[PDB]
């Protein structure tokens, strides 16, 4: 059960208590842990990381690493309450405002928030093409949903993202094909005994921050659990060729 904050900032008492009741149940130390934080008269102010800025002294791999590092400093959100609401069908202009709000509130983010932030921080670099990569996976009788931000620059594929697993987020710009990047996520999921049920490739996200256009999250959908790799490759390669055309 995952909650999304629909109260803005400061978080309302209803959402705030619900988050605390959730962490007290999931945690074996429960109330002792909760009281230690909530009743502490003095709590140390966490540092606000600086929003990274693109410099001519940087290569595209350097700039992507700086963006990823900022996302890592914000931290993966393990509270069970997602702080910023991401409406997938929303025009990009709206989502860029939420991206700016994330840099101002400076709180932990989940996978979706990280994709929107990644788009936001790469809008100014025209050689970098961005597109969402969505996975529906299976593990221990349940389905999981995850999103990363696919990158294409100078004949190489990579990704930016946030996940609780180090191998399911950022990938360096070394993949010669889209298929190599996807297959790497599939092999990375394997480490966690997940079966990739679906792969969804969206369209290249416009670089215009005030775009009326929503993000396209599913131009290509593949049932990779029912397919052989030669066929997943064929499909992914036909589509990536079209993206570059």
């Amino acid at each position: 059960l995952f909650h999304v904050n629909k109260s803005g900032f400061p978080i309302d008492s209803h959402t705030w208590e619900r988050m605390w009741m959730h962490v007290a149940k999931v945690h074996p130390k429960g109330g002792e842990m909760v009281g230690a934080i909530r009743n502490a008269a003095f709590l140390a102010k966490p540092s606000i990381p600086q929003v990274p800025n693109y410099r001519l002294s940087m290569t595209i791999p350097d700039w992507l690493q700086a963006i990823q590092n900022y996302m890592k400093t914000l931290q993966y959100n393990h509270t069970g309450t997602q702080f910023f609401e991401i409406r997938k069908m929303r025009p990009l202009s709206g989502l860029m405002e939420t991206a700016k709000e994330m840099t101002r509130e400076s709180l932990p983010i989940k996978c979706l928030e990280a994709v929107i932030l990644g788009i936001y921080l790469t809008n100014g670099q025209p050689s970098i093409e961005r597109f969402p990569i969505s996975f529906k996976t299976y593990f221990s009788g349940n389905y999981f949903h995850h999103v990363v931000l696919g990158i294409y620059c100078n004949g190489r594929y990579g990704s930016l993202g946030m996940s609780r697993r180090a191998e399911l987020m950022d990938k360096p710009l070394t993949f010669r094909t889209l298929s190599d990047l996807i297959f790497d996520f599939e092999d990375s999921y394997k480490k966690y005994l997940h079966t990739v049920k679906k792969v969804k490739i969206g369209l290249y996200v416009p670089h215009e921050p005030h775009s009326f256009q929503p993000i396209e999250w599913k131009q290509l959908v593949l049932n990779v659990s029912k397919m052989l790799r030669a066929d997943i490759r064929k499909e992914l390669e036909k589509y990536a060729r079209d993206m570059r055309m």
């Binding site: 900032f9 705030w16 934080i37 102010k45 931290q75 393990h78 509270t79 400076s106 709180l107 932990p108």
Partner: peptide
Amino acid sequence: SAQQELKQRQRAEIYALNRVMTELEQQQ
């Protein structure tokens, strides 16, 4: 002025709680 104070308290608790939950997930 009082409004930004609750946000600063909530952020300090969010990161204090997130440090704890990361560690819990690390174990489990």
